[PDB]
């Protein structure tokens, strides 16, 4: 790996600089280098890894959606324009799949198997669900097996989070938020999505009294997104 010669601490320092510079492809490469040193990640380092790859795949998803919309219009009255729209959508799609496969590969070699604390294990299993979900968004061929891989990862995370974390924990909240989005947007299960969002929101509301002012702010920010999706879905 091109980051094999750089100190772990230097990779983490440069990931933070790349975040400030909005250089998210560099940030992801630094954090991949840090993971490949083979030590477990701290909470802050897990968040850096998540920010970097979410920003890289976020640009790819946005581009893929623009190209897929143009390609769908072309397949309606529509003037034949040749293979270029499909080719370019395929190029972006292949790069998106590559980024997802890289994140899944880090989780499988060896972040998940070394993660024993609930906070780290739920974080990594939610990430596994997320990057299978991004694969599912573009899948048309193993679409079923990719959707099942996402569901299985989210379900293992949910089972640990419900046993080990309070209902206001931000990791637990964001896992439930993303699993609800899986149900609505991927799995054709809007009623499961709405039920999960509502139960998550209500159980968190009932535990807010236990929190400090700063924890309250962290939890309520995510609860607002559950409420924003419930307003969209109903």
């Amino acid at each position: 790996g091109a980051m094999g010669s750089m100190e772990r601490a230097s990779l983490i320092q440069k990931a933070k600089l790349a975040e400030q510079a909005e250089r998210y492809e560099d940030m992801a490469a630094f954090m991949k280098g840090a993971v490949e040193k083979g030590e477990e990640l701290s909470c802050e380092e897990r968040n850096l890894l998540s920010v970097a790859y979410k920003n890289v795949v976020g640009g790819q998803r946005a581009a893929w959606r623009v190209l897929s919309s143009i390609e769908q219009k072309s397949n309606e009255g529509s003037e034949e324009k040749g293979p270029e729209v499909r080719e370019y959508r395929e190029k972006v799609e292949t790069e998106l799949q590559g980024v997802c496969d890289t994140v899944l590969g880090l989780l499988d070699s060896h972040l998940i198997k070394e993660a024993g604390d609930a906070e780290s294990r739920v974080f990594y299993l939610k990430m596994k669900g997320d990057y299978y979900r991004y694969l599912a968004e573009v899948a048309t061929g193993d679409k079923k097996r990719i959707i099942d891989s996402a569901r299985s990862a989210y379900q293992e995370a949910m089972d640990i989070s419900k046993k080990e974390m309070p209902p206001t924990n931000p990791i637990r909240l964001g896992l439930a938020l993303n699993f609800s989005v899986f149900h609505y947007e991927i799995a054709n299960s809007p009623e499961e999505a709405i039920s999960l969002a509502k139960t998550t929101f209500d159980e968190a509301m009932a535990d807010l009294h236990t929190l400090s002012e700063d924890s309250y702010k962290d939890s309520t920010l995510i609860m607002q997104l559950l409420r924003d999706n419930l307003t969209l879905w109903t």
Binding site: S50, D130, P170, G174, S180, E185, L225, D228, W233
Partner: peptide, 9 residues
């Protein structure tokens, strides 16, 4: 249009 997922902190 699309559902909101967990954002970066």
């Amino acid at each position: 249009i699309r559902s909101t997922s967990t954002p970066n902190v």
